[PDB]
């Protein structure tokens, strides 16, 4: 029942050790297991009973627990170690009116591990206004293409004139480009009337705390 808390993200430099925490009110007396999951793939068991590795799992991966906190430690980290890590435990209790013990499998929300394998690279931003064809179809979509950045994570903010706009916004999770850097895309859906009535629209991308923005206006 109790919630299992994990850091949503952990960054580490190649070769160094990364540690991932998992906290829960009953963890001090509950066995913890850990699972790895690469995007689009099925989870894989990495550790159980707090510190035991199933066959095939390398010795550079270790599990421990202190108090109500379980920790998964990855030494000699490599780029391939990137992915999601989930901790898991159990809860058991009997209903007040009987019915035998009721079991619950608990999962942490997961931690995405990033291994910094190349220099930080600021994103290039290109903002495309609605095409004449889309406008003639009574629709309007602004497309913000973000490319050549590293690490692969960014946040996007849209503005109508100078005000923030969150409605009609959709953004993709950064995907690796042919050159190993990352790219991402963001869309803002508007009506032709909105597009025409504002002086401009902007796409402001924040990468590693630094912003890069582009602005467009009706032709």
């Amino acid at each position: 029942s109790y919630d299992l808390t994990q850091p949503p993200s952990v960054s580490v430099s190649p070769g160094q050790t990364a540690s991932i925490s998992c906290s829960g009110d009953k963890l001090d007396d509950k066995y913890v297991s850990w699972y790895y999951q690469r995007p689009g793939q099925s989870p894989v068991l990495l550790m159980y009973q707090d510190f035991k590795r199933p066959s095939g799992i390398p010795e550079r991966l270790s599990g421990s627990k202190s108090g109500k906190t379980a920790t998964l430690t990855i030494s000699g980290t490599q780029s391939l170690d990137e992915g999601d890590y989930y901790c898991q435990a159990w809860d058991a209790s009997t209903g007040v009116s009987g019915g035998g013990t009721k079991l619950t499998v608990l999962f942490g929300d997961g931690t995405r591990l990033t291994v910094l394998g190349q220099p930080k690279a600021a994103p290039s931003v290109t903002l495309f206004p609605p095409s004449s064809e889309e406008l003639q179809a009574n629709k309007a979509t602004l497309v913000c293409l973000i490319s050549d950045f590293y690490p692969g994570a960014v946040t996007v903010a849209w503005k109508a004139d100078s005000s923030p706009v969150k409605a009609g916004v959709e953004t993709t999770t950064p995907s690796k480009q042919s050159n190993n850097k990352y790219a991402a895309s963001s869309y803002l859906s508007l009506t032709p009337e909105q597009w025409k009535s504002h002086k401009s629209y902007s796409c402001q991308v924040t990468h590693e705390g630094s912003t890069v923005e582009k602005t467009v206006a009706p032709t």
Partner: peptide
């Protein structure tokens, strides 16, 4: 020099993507 992005799922229930 081609990059086709993953799709986004909009509030309409329909998907959209771009290739640059």
């Amino acid at each position: 020099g081609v990059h086709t992005f993953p799709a986004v799922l909009q509030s309409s229930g329909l998907y959209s993507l771009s290739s640059v």
